[PDB]
Design a protein around this ligand. Structure first.
Ligand SMILES: [Zn+2]
Lengths: 182, 147, 49, 175, 409
RNA sequence: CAGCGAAGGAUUUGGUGGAUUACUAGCUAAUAGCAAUCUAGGAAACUCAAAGAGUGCUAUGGUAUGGUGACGGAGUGCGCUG
């Protein structure tokens, strides 16, 4: 706040207005600057989900390795976390503490898969396009960036028709049909 | 209306009050003789004494400035602050300023009137308070450096 | 601030003696002059400035 | 007529210079090899030599019963001027009251003494710096690390207590 | 003696208004009549912002009167220099904000949002989201101790060190949500008012309240403390204003049966008492005194001189006022209400002679910087907060009052 | 050019007013009073802030005026210096 003098650095050292202990290195701020999250509290409503799956994976580790309730529920949880694409494979239950990340559950969001399959070219312009209302997953339009997708719907992320940026890329490649109205 | 609009209105009301040193410097460096770096370091006594000299010169040219030496250029007016008295005292001294300006509108080709109305610019802030009468009085001189 | 500003050692003077200083005398009229003598019989007069 | 993708402004730890880890907002220098040197010869040093001593060299001298100036003289067969830097002297004084004999043998009028101007009493740093600055010095030492430093910098002869007399290595005119 | 001879050197004089007739009562003097009777600088300080669309505006002034911090109930928080026309933060945090305060400057302010308390810098960038301070409704800064104090719908009182960044204290009120909250400026203990009709005086050392007073029936709507730390006015929801001695814990006055429950109280630096009952603001002069002739009345039954009628009153006819706050060193009362802010020219209501090395209304940028570092350096520890401030030089109240000479040992 | 073509035509923009839900009037302490009154990336700058470095300025109480009639001045005596 004043870049304190030396008898100043020594007399009080733990003073830091910018970064406290309970900031955890501002990882919420850092990852929402990374994946461009609109409002606050999305980080912590993902972190509650991460804590809940590691807690119930802990108590599924607690139960003895022979009963079908335990084994059916851990394979069901692993298949559902594969089916929403949080994972990339159906591997070990140790990946339910090494590989589940608030980062990866942000990786399944709609603007970042848009930047991933090059529909946009940056995540900021992806949020621009989907607040302007151009894209859809299957039939229905998507307005909010908080809609994360599942493993089936990374194939039907497409724009709507009459979206004029779709029309500009069609007339770029001059494959612009207009019987189909776009 | 918006908050920034209402605050621009309160800034335009409080335009002349110096509320810290930086506003006082930006507001007192507005001279009609000197540049800003000299004008910010000058006092009220200095600019008053050479404006009183120039009013004696202007009064021996034209003898209707002596009553302005009685009221607007007296030594009680060194300590008279403009924005501390009420609306009735304000309208009294603003028709005093209007009287001086439409008397000295004719004299604007000779430097005693510049050094004399320097004190109205810097004490009574007539470039920002009594500004319509100042423009209307010196409108003739528009090809000249004083305008 | 006193416990961090406590830097009391000014400096040793000269190169010392050869055999340990067993006698010292200031002169009570000049501020910076000091006579010191060691075990090997050498005495020295010092400007402490 | 608002803007799109509106965010709450927070601080940027990567960018904001108000915090401490972001307070970090050409002319080369290749020092020429010395004109005192041939390839690795050091053609310029000539007797009377001057030899920088350090603390383990003094300790090994007293442990092997070699005189300093007479051991230097019958090692090099030349007139030697031995030099105790103030940091070597500080190190001998810091060695305690076990090493009183070594300290008051270093206190000798025949052993001249330099005046180092730095903080701390690291004699190996001081000897290495003042020898690679100037190349007019013999280094008398028995530290293995200091011996490796000195014999890696070129043109600097190295003297050491070996056996019952001093030996000299990188001085190519000893006989 | 020499310290008391400084009252010659005091530059200014306090303001007043005096009736000069027996037909001329003082509570029936209109704000337009004040604005005509006083100078142009004070008439321009009597501002009025009409901010209609976001909610009732909680008002807050900096401890020198230079900056104003308003919060709409909906989302609109604006920190501004109310006496120039300079705003330096206008941020629309679209969740329901409740209260805000400055910390040690206009350079940082803390806002109490939907749940979490946030801390913003001078231009409005978010510095901190406090994961503790779960549901604040009342924030107040302790400037000599650098402590942000927080209470609200949880029954918890939290002291948070702003300089280090460290939550100093969490205290169970154990009395439900905190209905009112005020700070003693004298000794920095916190008077919280609960739904019992109980005020409790708290310090961040003791996990129990230092004192519990039974102020009102019902809940306690508002608390204000004098800056001398001697008197406390509490309004309950039982239509009862009560003036309390703080040091000896006597109850000085009990104005019962107000016409409608007093939603706010405030005490100026010169001891005025501003009560607000919805549309109405009513100020009494010399009401914080011991004698029964200083009990604040509403009329003088037949012209009794021994009845403290209102010093002045105003009616905000459209709305219901949200909070009250006197402007520190000026003669104004800023009341924040449903459609924004209104300053009232209250002539008796401010310390005319501030000290310019405690806190300066004309302070510059360099003076702000150096005063920030110096007060940060002499920050008082949170353990030194006691009910009396003069009890940290003394000896224990154990450890016998005669020192012992080892013969008697 | 043709064509269209009534004391002119086109484009752009600032402000205000009315609608954007289905019209029972303002205030207050409200079965009434009042309403005259409740009271007895880039560009620009006399833009706004946040900080850093350097430079300038007698920047001068080593213990603050010659003096709370308790004081001052004059003179004398003691003291002091060469
Ligand atoms: Zn050295």
């Amino acid at each position: 706040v004043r870049k304190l003098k030396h008898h100043e650095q020594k007399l009080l050292k733990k003073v830091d207005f910018l970064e406290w202990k309970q900031d955890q290195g501002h990882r919420d701020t850092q990852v929402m600057r990374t994946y461009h999250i609109q409002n606050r509290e999305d980080y912590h409503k993902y972190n509650r989900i991460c804590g809940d799956i590691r807690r119930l994976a802990n108590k599924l580790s607690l139960l003895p390795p022979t009963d079908p309730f335990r084994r059916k529920h851990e394979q069901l949880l692993l298949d559902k976390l594969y089916a929403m694409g949080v994972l990339t494979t159906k591997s070990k239950i140790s990946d339910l503490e090494n590989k589940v990340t608030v980062s990866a559950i942000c990786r399944r969001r709609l603007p970042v898969i848009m930047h991933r399959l090059k529909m946009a070219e940056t995540i900021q312009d992806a949020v621009k396009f989907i607040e302007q209302g151009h894209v859809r997953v299957g039939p229905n339009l998507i307005n909010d960036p908080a809609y994360l997708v599942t493993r089936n719907m990374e194939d039907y992320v497409t724009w709507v028709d009459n979206s004029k940026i779709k029309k500009t890329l069609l007339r770029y490649r001059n494959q612009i049909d207009d019987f189909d109205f776009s | 209306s918006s908050l920034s609009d209402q605050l621009a209105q309160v800034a335009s009301n409080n335009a002349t009050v110096a509320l810290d040193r930086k506003r006082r410097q930006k507001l007192h460096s507005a001279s009609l003789i000197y540049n800003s770096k000299t004008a910010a370091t000058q006092d009220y006594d200095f600019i008053f004494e050479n404006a009183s000299k120039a009013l004696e010169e202007l009064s021996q040219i034209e003898p209707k400035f002596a009553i302005f030496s009685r009221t607007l250029f007296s030594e009680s007016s060194i300590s008279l602050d403009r924005n501390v008295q009420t609306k009735e005292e304000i309208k009294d001294l603003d028709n005093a300023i209007n009287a001086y300006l439409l008397l000295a509108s004719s004299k604007w080709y000779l430097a005693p009137t510049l050094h004399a109305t320097e004190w109205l610019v810097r004490r009574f802030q007539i470039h920002v308070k009594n500004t319509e009468m100042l423009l209307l009085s010196t409108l003739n001189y528009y090809q000249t450096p004083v305008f | 601030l006193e416990r961090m500003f406590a830097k009391p050692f000014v400096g040793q003077l000269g190169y010392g003696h050869r055999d340990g200083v067993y006698a010292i005398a200031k002169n009570y009229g000049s501020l910076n002059k000091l006579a010191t003598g060691s075990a090997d019989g050498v005495i020295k007069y010092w400007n402490m400035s | 007529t608002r803007k799109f993708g509106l965010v709450k402004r927070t601080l940027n730890t990567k960018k904001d210079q108000r915090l401490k880890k972001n307070q970090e907002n050409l002319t080369r220098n290749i020092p020429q090899v010395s004109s005192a040197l041939f390839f690795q010869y050091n053609q310029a040093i000539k007797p009377p030599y001057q030899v920088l001593i350090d603390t383990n060299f003094i300790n090994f001298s007293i442990q092997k019963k070699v005189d300093i100036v007479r051991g230097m003289m019958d090692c090099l067969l030349a007139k030697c001027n031995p030099l105790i830097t103030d940091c070597v002297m500080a190190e001998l004084e810091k060695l305690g009251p076990k090493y009183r004999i070594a300290l008051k043998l270093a206190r000798d009028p025949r052993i001249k003494r330099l005046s180092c101007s730095h903080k701390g009493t690291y004699a190996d740093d001081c000897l290495v710096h003042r020898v690679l600055q100037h190349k007019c010095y013999i280094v008398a030492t028995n530290d293995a690390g200091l011996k490796q430093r000195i014999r890696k910098i070129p043109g600097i002869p190295l003297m050491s207590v070996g056996g019952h007399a001093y030996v000299i290595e990188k001085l190519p005119d000893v006989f | 003696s020499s310290a008391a001879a400084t009252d010659y050197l005091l530059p200014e004089s306090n303001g007043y208004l005096e009736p000069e007739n027996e037909l001329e009562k003082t509570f029936k003097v209109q704000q337009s009549e004040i604005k005509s009777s006083v100078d142009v600088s004070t008439a321009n300080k009597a501002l009025d912002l009409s901010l209609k669309e976001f909610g009732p505006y909680h008002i807050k002034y900096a401890k020198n009167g230079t900056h104003l911090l308003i919060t709409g109930r909906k989302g609109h928080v604006a920190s501004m220099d109310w006496r120039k026309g300079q705003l330096r933060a206008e941020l629309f945090l679209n969740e329901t904000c409740h209260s805000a305060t400055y910390l040690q400057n206009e350079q940082y302010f803390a806002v109490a949002q939907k749940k979490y308390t946030f801390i913003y810098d001078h231009e409005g960038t978010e510095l901190h989201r406090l994961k503790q301070h779960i549901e604040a409704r009342h924030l107040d800064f302790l400037p000599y101790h650098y402590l942000l104090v927080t209470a609200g719908e949880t029954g918890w009182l939290k002291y948070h060190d702003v300089s280090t960044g460290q939550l100093v204290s969490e205290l169970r009120t154990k009395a439900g949500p905190t209905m009112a909250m005020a700070q003693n400026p004298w000794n920095a203990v916190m008077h919280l008012g609960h739904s019992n009709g109980t005020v409790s005086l708290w310090s961040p050392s003791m996990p129990e309240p230092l004192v519990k007073l039974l102020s009102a029936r019902g809940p306690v709507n508002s608390i204000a403390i004098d800056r001398s730390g001697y008197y406390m006015a509490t309004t309950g929801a039982d239509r009862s204003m009560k003036i309390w001695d703080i040091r000896n814990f006597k109850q000085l006055h009990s104005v019962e049966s107000l016409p409608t429950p007093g939603t706010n109280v405030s005490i100026s630096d010169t001891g005025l008492l501003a009560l607000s009952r919805g549309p109405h603001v009513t100020l009494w002069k010399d009401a914080l005194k011991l004698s029964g002739d200083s009990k604040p009345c509403f009329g003088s039954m037949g012209g009794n001189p021994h009845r403290n009628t209102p010093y002045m009153s105003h009616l905000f006819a459209g709305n219901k006022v949200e909070n009250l706050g006197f402007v520190p060193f000026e003669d104004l009362l800023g009341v924040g209400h449903q459609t924004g802010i209104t300053n009232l020219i209250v002539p008796g209501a401010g310390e005319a002679n501030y000290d310019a090395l405690e806190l300066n209304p004309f302070e510059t940028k360099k003076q702000r910087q150096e005063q920030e570092v110096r007060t940060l350096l002499n920050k008082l520890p949170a353990d030194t907060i006691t009910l009396d401030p003069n009890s940290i030089g003394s000896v224990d109240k154990r450890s016998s009052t005669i020192r012992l000479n080892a013969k008697d040992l």
